Design a protein around this ligand. Structure first.
Ligand SMILES: O=C(Nc1ccc(N(Cc2ccsc2)C(=O)Cn2nnc3ccccc32)cc1)C1CC1
Ligand SMILES: O=C(Nc1ccc(N(Cc2ccsc2)C(=O)Cn2nnc3ccccc32)cc1)C1CC1
Lengths: 304, 304
């Protein structure tokens, strides 16, 4: 028992991190097979971030201008190309530590682990959620760009995120591994405000089921609700509207605990209306929304 | 910016996890050089956990009774010995993935990452603190025993914890890598209650400095306090008494922010007395105590 914000073991990803330097700028790259993936803003100078013309900036760069170092060994760059907001540096050596992998574009509300890196070296790993407003609340300092987000299914690493920027609000924006930004963000040093950060209702419910499984049950009540009644309350508290698809994914947790999804919704409704009253749930004094129903099942069953 | 409960990259530890089976029981072992370390209760049956005589139980076991598998390859056991509550299985092959390592016995209040494993395979990584009552609030299911806690300094892995048991209260107990239990716990299926779980005051203060660095400052006040005045309040709220050594370790954070340690203590005092008033600090509605002053500095500087 016990419930923790658990990240995937990062070893398979650590073996892919490299350092990419272009002129004065150094950031992280992801080396898979004979390609190194990195944010295209690696080619930008101080007077560029303001309004960069990446096509015009990339014209002044050749294969030899991109310095890729893996550990203490230099990789030879034989090709370079821009795909949306990422650069793909073709190297002459396939990464011998390349795991089985996929590039996936995750849905808002889904979770992933981030391996924060600096100068191609890993510093830490933590679990994140893609917010409904397509930002992530990460922990990144200058030099962390190119750090990636991922999920792992047995031996396959699904890369879903690459870190590119920090908005003036301290939240983070980035792309999938095809270089497409999550949300409306652009790789430009401009005021870009994130939209309303709504709570991932399906995840809070999954976490409430995790709490019941692990012994925290004070919040269980004698009430029930309907999807429409619950959604009226969810709207007021800037919670995502719950759908029948959400109810369906909560099915295994509902079956395991014997608490119908709508009864758990009624517990959530009362917690939203009345607060925690100074109490805690799984060591938290607020409703946790960064565990999907899949994460709860995985952690409560021990999937390796 | 941003602040997260970050764990160390687990790759160096993943390469050490093996599966150890003795009779019907399977748990995790740690393979470093030519030795596999695992909890000695791997030799116990159902009618043993109640009151096991490990010396008498180990007498009926030979090198061939301990099955050690690393991935899909079997290791040959050429020696076995019991050191306190761990078994040391000498194997004929040095682990080719053995990192530079140390065995350290951590102090209560210090933090570490846990690589949770099942059948020698890693499932996840999370950050823990050794509670002042020598328990850890982990996430472990049956089969997780032998999972280890560790810290990493550049390339050196300091192993500090090995998981052995879950107390009837859902908290976890374990040993250092010499097999000595943290706290008064014994590897026996008996009621063993943990003592009072006090809050790690030096860590809450370090987290409050992390909050100021990352922009959360509503809790800063116009007051100050003394060590004795603060400790009167800390006693009432089951917080660890703050010492001059604690003040000294908070020194770099105090210097970075320009907020004297005793002024931060006065903010903590008011938060203890008046609560959060429905507000949050670094996305938490309670005072976080599982970040040491070293963790805050490391995360806020980007040590890899
Ligand atoms: O100034 C340089 N580069 C350089 C500067 C800023 C950035 N930007 C914005 C940007 C994006 C596309 S263009 C400009 C970031 O937000 C990067 N970021 N991400 N997480 C951060 C956390 C803290 C601080 C910065 C962080 C990206 C690149 C060269 C070294 C001289
Ligand atoms: O029953 C067997 N072994 C077997 C049973 C219990 C245990 N024990 C207590 C114990 C310790 C020394 S003696 C008995 C644990 O607390 C292990 N633990 N740790 N985390 C857990 C989280 C959830 C459940 C159990 C957990 C250790 C070993 C053999 C497979 C048949």
């Amino acid at each position: 028992s016990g419930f923790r914000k658990m990240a995937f073991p990062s070893g398979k990803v650590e073996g892919c991190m490299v350092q990419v330097t272009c002129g004065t700028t150094t950031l992280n790259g992801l080396w898979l097979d004979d390609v190194v993936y990195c944010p295209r803003h690696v080619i930008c100078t101080s007077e560029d971030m303001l309004n960069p013309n990446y096509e015009d900036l990339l014209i002044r760069k050749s294969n030899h201008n991109f310095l890729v170092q893996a550990g203490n060994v230099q990789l030879r760059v034989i090709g370079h190309s821009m795909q949306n907001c990422v650069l793909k540096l073709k190297v002459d050596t396939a990464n011998p530590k390349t795991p089985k992998y996929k590039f996936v574009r995750i849905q808002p509300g889904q979770t992933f682990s981030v391996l924060a890196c600096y100068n191609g070296s890993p510093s830490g790993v933590y679990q994140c959620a893609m917010r409904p407003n397509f930002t992530i609340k990460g922990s990144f300092l200058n030099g962390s760009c190119g750090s990636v987000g991922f999920n792992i299914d047995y031996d396959c690493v699904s890369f879903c995120y690459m870190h590119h920027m920090e908005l003036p609000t301290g939240v983070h924006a980035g792309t999938d591994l095809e270089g497409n930004f999550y949300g409306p963000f652009v790789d430009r040093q401009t005021a870009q405000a994130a939209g309303t950060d709504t709570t991932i209702t399906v995840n809070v419910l999954a976490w409430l089921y995790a709490a019941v499984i692990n012994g925290d049950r004070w919040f269980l009540n004698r009430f029930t609700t309907t999807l429409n009644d619950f959604n009226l309350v969810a709207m007021k508290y800037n919670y995502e509207p719950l759908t029948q698809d959400h109810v369906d994914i909560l099915g295994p947790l509902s079956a395991q605990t014997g608490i119908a999804v709508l009864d758990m919704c009624a517990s959530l409704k009362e917690l939203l209306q009345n607060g925690m009253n100074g109490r805690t749930i799984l060591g938290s004094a607020l409703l946790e929304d960064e565990f999907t129903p899949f994460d709860v099942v995985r952690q409560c069953s021990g999937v390796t």
